[PDB]
């Protein structure tokens, strides 16, 4: 395939986070699916090392692997939860919960 952002809804009960997350119990986390195949275009914002390793992969595919398709930017969500001390906490921007951009690294 091709490294791209896909949809992914996460129910916290399924992962067991219902034990402390009061809301929203379920949200859109997104997912980076696909592979980083040569050539790496601009739309995955490749780094020089990612480009190097990819070129090495072409030369030595049995010894060196290709770049991985990972989230480049992450977006916050609104989360109401309980602290470790049980203190009710509401955070309008709970950073790093959903994928904003995907890329090759």
């Amino acid at each position: 395939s091709h490294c791209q952002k896909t949809s992914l809804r996460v129910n916290f009960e399924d992962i067991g986070w219902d034990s402390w997350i009061i809301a929203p119990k379920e949200y859109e986390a997104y997912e980076c699916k696909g592979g980083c195949f040569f050539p790496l275009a601009d739309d995955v914002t490749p780094t020089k090392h990612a480009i190097v390793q990819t070129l090495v992969h072409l030369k030595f595919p049995t010894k060196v692997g290709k770049a991985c398709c990972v989230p480049t930017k992450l977006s916050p969500i609104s989360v109401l939860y309980k602290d470790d001390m049980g203190v009710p906490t509401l955070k309008y921007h709970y950073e790093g919960m959903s994928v904003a951009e995907c890329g090759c690294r």
């Binding site: 609104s78 049980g86 203190v87 009710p88 906490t89 509401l90 955070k91 921007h93 950073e95």
Partner: protein
């Protein structure tokens, strides 16, 4: 137990399509830990309540606003249909004493509030909490005294619902932001997740 609906309503407010983003990113709810109540006397004709909390805000956080929510109600009194009118004042307790309540110690005035309707009242007491965060380990704080003064044509036993009662007890609402603009807070958030993981 469960968090107050006020926190949930704040969440619902934030998640509803509001045109205005909140002033504070971090909001916490701190219920009262213990309460010392003294009935009205001839020398001091008002209800006295010393409320002890356990507020603990990280030093990397810069708090914006704090609210003390109390439930004002004529406490199931006879002739309670004669009205409900009065005022209440909250003091930050600096020095305490095991004699009476307001009849001793050291206090700083916070908020004066005239009351009418039975229900929840909100008192902006950000000042006290800021001093509690900046403890300096010299004076014993993290607590405050609330006095309830009834007017002439009012309820006999006008008061706020406090311990040892179990219905509509007082609690703190702290509005806070991160000093490092989210740098230090999200780090402590992460360590919490690995602990929950």
């Amino acid at each position: 137990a469960e968090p107050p609906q006020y926190m949930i309503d704040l969440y619902n407010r934030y998640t509803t399509d509001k045109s205005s983003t909140p002033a504070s990113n971090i909001v916490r709810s701190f219920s009262v830990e213990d309460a010392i109540s003294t009935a009205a006397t001839e020398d001091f004709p008002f209800q006295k309540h010393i409320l002890i909390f356990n507020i603990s805000i990280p030093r990397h956080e810069q708090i914006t606003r704090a609210e003390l929510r109390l439930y004002v109600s004529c406490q199931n009194d006879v002739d309670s249909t004669h009205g409900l009118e009065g005022s209440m004042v909250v003091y930050d307790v600096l020095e305490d004493s095991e004699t009476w309540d307001q009849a001793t110690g050291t206090k700083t005035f916070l908020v004066s509030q005239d009351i009418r309707d039975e229900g929840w009242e909100t008192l902006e007491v950000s000042s006290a909490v800021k001093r509690w965060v900046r403890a300096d380990s010299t004076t014993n704080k993290n607590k405050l005294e609330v006095t309830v003064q009834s007017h002439r044509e009012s309820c006999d036993t006008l008061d706020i619902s406090v311990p040892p009662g179990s219905k509509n007890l007082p609690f703190f609402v702290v509005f806070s932001n991160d000093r490092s603009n989210g740098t230090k807070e999200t780090r402590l958030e992460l360590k919490e997740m690995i602990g929950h993981e």
